[PDB]
Design a protein around this ligand. Structure first.
Ligand SMILES: NC(=O)c1ccc[n+]([C@@H]2O[C@H](COP(=O)([O-])OP(=O)(O)OC[C@H]3O[C@@H](n4cnc5c(N)ncnc54)[C@H](OP(=O)(O)O)[C@@H]3O)[C@@H](O)[C@H]2O)c1
Ligand SMILES: O=C(O)COc1cc(F)ccc1C(=O)NCC1CC1
Length: 316
């Protein structure tokens, strides 16, 4: 298992990164410092997570300490849905850069295919509770992302939560200048994503798996929901390999040629989650984990199911 995967922009991306959604602002600086200290070189960020300033403090301090060099880090962020208009994309990227205290991003993603009305609210609502769309289409947002590459703000651009027809729309965009480098999607043994992964990989797009542990801290979790970390079948595979269940859940996507971005703010777990380059799941283990698919999503964007670009009505 090599530590990095080659992207279609010619750059290499670390296959293991640290997630930061829900990482409290008073804990995420130390989480990222610990992560870098114990070997992480890839941090997954987003403006909508409301903690990029604090992530940036950690990055800057580790650069200043010369624990790492900037070229060794791979920093990812994402354009929120209220910034899909062409006149807002650069400023949204620039706010992220200024918060992260960087002069470029390694990768900048369209966070969701759905554009929303611009304004202060991340989920602008009508009086009846529907999220108010933007009319700016996907393809025009992509052209604005391409301009960030040409301005030196970002090394690579990509997409997140795009279904295969939406990926295809960009690949088929008239005048396409840069292909997506990455599609970041939810993926774990309960949502195995074979069809969409195969499609993306066949086009040279690298897939990043988010919520690989099943996001036990997601704010809408219900007691009766399935739990990957507590699934006795996964625990058994972990025991056979003398690893933790989380370590198996992280190694699983790695062996599918995916990038994976587990989140933790717990120092012990941050270190645990990185010790996944010292064992191999068998093909039988992999197929067994794949067999647990139930099409179960952490992140279904349930407030946006009527948006024209809602991604999850299509099979994949
Ligand atoms: N593009 C998108 O739309 C999108 C959507 C979802 C997620 N993401 C990205 O993907 C990242 C990961 O997904 P996620 O945050 O939803 O969830 P996750 O990584 O599947 O799970 C995070 C949870 O697992 C716990 N945990 C971590 N390591 C553990 C271990 N070794 N043992 C036991 N529990 C452990 C964490 O607890 P502690 O933190 O308390 O240790 C936290 O509660 C996000 O943070 C974000 O960066 C992107
Ligand atoms: O957007 C994400 O990557 C993860 O969070 C979501 C996932 C959903 F299925 C639905 C909504 C959110 C959400 O409110 N996002 C904005 C701030 C919470 C970060």
């Amino acid at each position: 298992m090599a530590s990095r995967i080659l992207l279609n922009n010619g750059a290499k991306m670390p296959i293991l990164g640290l997630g930061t959604w829900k990482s409290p602002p008073g804990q995420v600086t130390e989480a990222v410092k610990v992560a870098i200290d114990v070997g992480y070189r890839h941090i997954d960020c987003a403006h909508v997570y409301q903690n990029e300033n604090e992530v940036g403090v950690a990055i800057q301090e580790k650069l200043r300490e010369q624990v790492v060099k900037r070229e060794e880090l791979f920093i990812v962020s994402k354009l929120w849905c209220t910034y899909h208009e062409k006149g807002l994309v650069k400023g949204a990227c620039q706010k992220t850069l200024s918060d992260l205290k960087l002069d470029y991003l390694d990768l900048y993603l369209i966070h969701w295919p759905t554009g929303f009305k611009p304004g202060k609210e991340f989920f602008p609502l009508d009086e009846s509770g529907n999220v108010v769309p933007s009319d700016t289409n996907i393809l025009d947002t992509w052209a604005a992302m391409e301009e960030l590459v040409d301005e030196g703000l970002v090394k690579a651009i990509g997409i997140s939560n795009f279904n295969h027809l939406q990926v295809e729309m960009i690949l088929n965009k008239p005048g396409l200048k840069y292909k997506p480098a990455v599609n970041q999607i939810e993926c774990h043994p309960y949502l195995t994503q074979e069809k969409l992964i195969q499609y993306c990989q066949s086009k040279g797009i690298v897939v990043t798996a988010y919520s690989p542990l099943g996001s036990p801290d997601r704010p809408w979790a219900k007691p009766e929901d399935p739990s990957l970390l507590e699934d006795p079948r996964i625990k058994a595979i972990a025991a056979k390999h003398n690893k933790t269940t989380a370590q198996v859940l992280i190694r699983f996507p790695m062996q599918r040629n995916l990038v994976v971005i587990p989140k933790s703010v717990t120092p012990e777990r941050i270190a645990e989650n990185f010790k996944v380059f010292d064992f191999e799941l068998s093909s039988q283990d992999m197929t067994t984990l794949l067999s647990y698919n139930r099409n179960w999503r952490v992140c279904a964007l349930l407030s946006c199911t009527s948006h024209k670009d809602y991604p999850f009505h299509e099979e994949f």
